[PDB]
Ligand binder design. Structure first.
Ligand code: NA
Ligand code: NA
Lengths: 183, 183, 184
């Protein structure tokens, strides 16, 4: 009982664009209990035409907010992820980011709640690697009384010229991370 | 049984140069089962004069292709790694990259099969850090029907000027990665 | 018992400025036994005014050297970390140490293989711009006492075209993740 995840190769399970009716992204997320940490793995594939045209511009931003109740279960209504996580062979509380290490803030000082790094996009044409700034915010903000934990992923494209000129499957190469886990 | 590796500080065990008669590199590779993922660690040391003069130019590329049969055992003839992996204390299928998450491709779009990142080379003179693009291709391609799994490492040097002007031990700083594992 | 760490959100527990009287930094370090490796997590928060003005310049360097005896216990006098590590569950920490075979103590200057290299980030107080910090971890390689059996050295380097801050601000380094081959 070490793994909390989206399952492998999930059907569209999340909503990237502001007001969309349909899930427009496939989020792959794996969380593994490893002593006092969680080991993490995250990658994203775009589904809708709107998502898959975002890299038609030189800048772009994708944000997925996940909120969990006190039992560590996904709050579907509030979250961008619309399908609950599950165990690999089956109180997901033990997978959650620690509220001590990453507390909810009553001010804008929040630097210690962030993980920062880089993953990559492969262009469709010549297969160039385009850097994407990835930041993960742990807890920090809350939007309702039902929220006990939170994980926010944000990818940023910031290039001198657009990676694509036409529609193409948006993919983000896997990003690896750890954080101090709850209880 | 939770570790599959080359052993610590192995002898020359891999073949970087095409037609070489002798193993010309020491590959250190550690794969650890961690819930639904494998945690990986990989670094390379050059042995032959040819390898240790590659960084005498401003661009260079090193590619190690590992192929495994259906039991997760190294296919020595086909691979660049010439010495089979082993456990830390002594049954390798469970260490392999998942064929569901990283399938073999008959299309051309193998974007989702790649891990990308950066490690570093320390120059012999002032010990300045030179960036190396590292990409790991999981599965995707199979040269032979014996092959059930594959892991490919590729280091790229792409500098404005050559890191060295003479022979010097090629070393790549350890690169860390995870991937979704089989069964 | 798989975790050796500083505890969560520790008090000032290390010394960035060599010759200071008081602990001037909070080091968060987590080491987890994972088969043949240790999985690592490290981040730093500055405490003193001196530390929190370092990023007032365009270049800066922070070095923390940890030394351990043959039992894997912190040598407090020799180290920059002044508070001993402990297990998560509240007599060997040897199994958490960097392998002396994979990362040996040397007698010359050809020790590339003892180094881990990577990047973490500083968030500026002004517009929250991300400033890159070169992080390098040296395993073993060096002794400075008959009692040193293992060593871990963390070094952060700021090297920018202009200074991240113009005034005092809390120095923080975003978490850096690493693995190494562990002892026994
Ligand atoms: Na719920
Ligand atoms: Na709360």
């Amino acid at each position: 009982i070490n793994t909390l995840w989206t399952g492998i190769k999930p059907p569209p399970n999340c909503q990237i664009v502001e007001n969309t009716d349909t899930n427009d992204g496939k989020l792959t997320l794996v969380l593994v209990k490893n002593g006092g940490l969680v080991n993490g793995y995250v990658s994203l594939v775009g589904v809708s035409d709107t998502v898959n045209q975002m890299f038609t511009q030189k800048s772009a931003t994708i944000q997925l907010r996940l909120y969990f109740d006190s039992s560590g279960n996904l709050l579907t209504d509030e979250s961008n992820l619309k399908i609950p996580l599950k165990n690999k062979s089956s109180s997901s509380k033990a997978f959650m980011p620690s509220t001590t290490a990453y507390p909810f803030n009553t001010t804008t000082r929040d630097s210690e709640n962030y993980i920062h790094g880089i993953c990559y996009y492969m262009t469709s044409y010549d297969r160039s690697l385009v850097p994407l700034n990835i930041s993960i915010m742990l807890n920090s903000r809350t939007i309702s009384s039902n929220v006990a934990y939170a994980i926010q992923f944000e990818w940023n494209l910031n290039a001198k010229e657009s990676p694509e000129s036409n529609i193409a499957t948006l993919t983000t190469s896997p990003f690896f991370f750890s954080y101090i886990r709850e209880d």
